[PDB]
Write a protein that binds this ligand. Structure first.
Ligand SMILES: [Zn+2]
Lengths: 418, 145
């Protein structure tokens, strides 16, 4: 006989409603009196926050603050769903990394900076740039967390799909009582931990200064473009993600390793004015393994060059139709604490350019795999070594939706810096 | 190997013990209360039948979240029967059947507007003019983008 939905006990109905997407709850709520009333049951929304946005709200916190999960879903989670993820700020050539994330009754824009040069194995430093706070009865507030004088008014604008912007409404807080000299030393201390001096090298001294001045011009009014972590694959792979790498005088840069057939790509997440954020910095030819000779041939620079240009050669013909390691004499390395065993070597090419990314080109070199989360690149024509090491942090909402989508994201961030 | 089940309206069913005990309710009535036959005053005979088919299909069971075909087919019935199954499955405590009958209702709601939901399930709009204005407002946030 002819039962309807409307005759089911409330408890069954809650089961069923608690199982649906949160975005279907608001239609159900407008169907009738009984559904509106039932949909005031927080358990339903507490499940919707957990399963869809990863957040398990505290009940005690909910009681103190007077906020409910219906509120959280509606006014925080869904309202702001599009800025969640992993981002790269648009800051001329320098990039950056923001992971925008849900904690409790907050959404937090976390900036991840590299460790001090040259300590590529030290962990990423991290600080909030902005937060979004839900309180009882109110719309969620937007606040900027830069830089030293506490949280203060901000704005957010979701431009599209894959871009958003922050404004700060009260920059009086970024300032410091000593002035801009002091802003500069604290900044120097956190990014370098070196003395306003120590290095002497006017060149790094100059690069550091200019970067300070260029980025600090974005007070902190920035636009962010979406980026993704690279797809895991079992065979055609030995372990992607983000690494921290030595880039000489520019200091440490963040580089995303990803796999693309029998070829790996090194993509800049942060960069410098020679080769900017968003560009291919490295490419590893994964079918042109190079054999590691004994250790006194390893020491021989020219042996190494002959061998590497001979592979360059054979590569150019086609596109027509652990164990002891040491750098060669003449090859510099900012680190010196690069491992003395390695598994494999492979031919690869780096991207080089003059200042302003002028007249870029691929120079030969050789990629060196040390550990699961440690590798290097010998820059032949610069007689120079780069040591990369895995960024150990973990990132929320950062996965490409699909593989072709990741290869699209690479294409967009490369083009904005073309 | 066999016990007797009694429908709300008198019909008796000889069912295998281990099939019957997928219903935790029955298993309690048989073991703890010693009933044989087990009167099910809330489940009519046509419904009991289907519930015995289901449990029997599912007798061996080591699930996922996506409705197996065999069960989709079992559920190609009319609404009223689908809700009688939900209620029967709630009364008898058969988790698998409850789950699968409820997911099924839920897929019938997935993405519908309030209008389409009322027509699907014949629910009368019982809001007053004010209340309805009020629900609309309370739920604007969903058309945010
Ligand atoms: Zn600010």
């Amino acid at each position: 006989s002819g039962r309807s939905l409307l005759e089911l006990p409330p408890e069954l109905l809650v089961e069923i409603f608690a199982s649906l997407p949160g975005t279907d709850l608001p239609s159900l709520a407008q169907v009738c009196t009984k559904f509106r009333r039932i949909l005031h049951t927080d358990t339903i929304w507490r499940r919707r926050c957990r399963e869809e946005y990863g957040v398990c709200e505290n009940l005690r916190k909910l009681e103190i603050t007077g906020v409910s999960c219906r509120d959280v879903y509606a006014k925080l989670l869904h309202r702001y769903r599009h800025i969640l993820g992993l981002w790269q700020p648009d800051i001329g050539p320098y990039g950056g990394l923001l992971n925008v994330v849900v904690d409790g009754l907050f959404i937090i824009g976390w900036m991840y900076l590299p460790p001090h040069d040259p300590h590529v194995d030290d962990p990423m430093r991290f600080k909030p740039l902005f937060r979004i706070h839900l309180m009882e009865r109110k719309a969620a507030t937007v606040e900027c967390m830069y830089g030293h004088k506490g949280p203060h008014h901000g704005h957010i604008q979701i431009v599209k799909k894959d871009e958003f912007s922050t404004k700060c409404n009260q920059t009086d807080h970024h300032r410091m009582s000593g002035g801009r000299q002091e802003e500069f030393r604290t900044w120097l201390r956190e990014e370098w931990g070196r003395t306003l001096e120590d290095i002497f090298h006017e060149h790094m001294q100059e690069l550091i200064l200019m970067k300070f001045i260029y980025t600090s011009q974005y007070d902190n009014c920035l636009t962010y473009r979406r980026i993704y972590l690279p797809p895991s694959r079992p065979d055609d792979l030995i372990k992607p993600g983000l690494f921290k790498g030595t880039y000489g005088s520019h200091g440490l840069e963040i580089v995303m390793l990803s796999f693309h057939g029998r070829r790996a790509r090194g993509t800049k997440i942060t960069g410098d004015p020679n080769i900017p954020a968003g560009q291919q910095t490295v490419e590893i030819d994964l079918r042109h393994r190079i054999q590691l000779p004994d250790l006194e041939n390893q020491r021989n620079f020219n042996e190494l060059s002959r061998i590497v240009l001979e592979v360059r050669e054979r590569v150019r013909q086609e596109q027509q139709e652990g164990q002891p390691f040491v750098l060669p004499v003449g090859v510099s390395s900012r680190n010196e604490d690069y491992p003395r065993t390695c598994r494999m070597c492979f031919y690869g090419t780096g991207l080089i350019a003059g200042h302003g990314f002028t007249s870029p080109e691929r120079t030969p070199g050789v990629f060196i795999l040390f550990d699961e989360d440690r590798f290097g690149f010998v820059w032949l024509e610069l007689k120079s070594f780069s040591l990369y090491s895995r960024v150990q942090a973990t990132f929320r909402n950062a996965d490409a939706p699909s593989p072709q989508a990741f290869d699209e994201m690479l294409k967009n961030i490369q083009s904005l810096t073309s | 190997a066999s016990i007797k089940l009694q429908s709300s309206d008198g019909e008796i069913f000889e069912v295998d013990v281990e099939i019957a005990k997928q219903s935790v309710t029955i298993k309690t009535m048989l073991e703890d209360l010693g009933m044989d036959p087990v009167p099910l005053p809330n489940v009519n005979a046509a419904i009991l039948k289907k519930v015995i088919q289901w449990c029997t299909h599912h007798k061996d069971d080591p699930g996922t979240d996506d409705i197996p075909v065999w069960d989709q087919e079992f559920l190609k019935v009319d609404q009223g029967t689908l809700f009688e199954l939900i209620l029967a499955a709630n009364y008898l405590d058969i988790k698998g059947l409850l789950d699968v009958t409820c997911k099924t209702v839920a897929n019938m709601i997935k993405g519908k507007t309030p209008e389409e939901i009322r027509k699907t399930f014949n629910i009368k709009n019982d809001f007053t003019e004010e209340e309805e204005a009020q629900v609309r407002k309370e739920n604007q946030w969903c058309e945010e983008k």
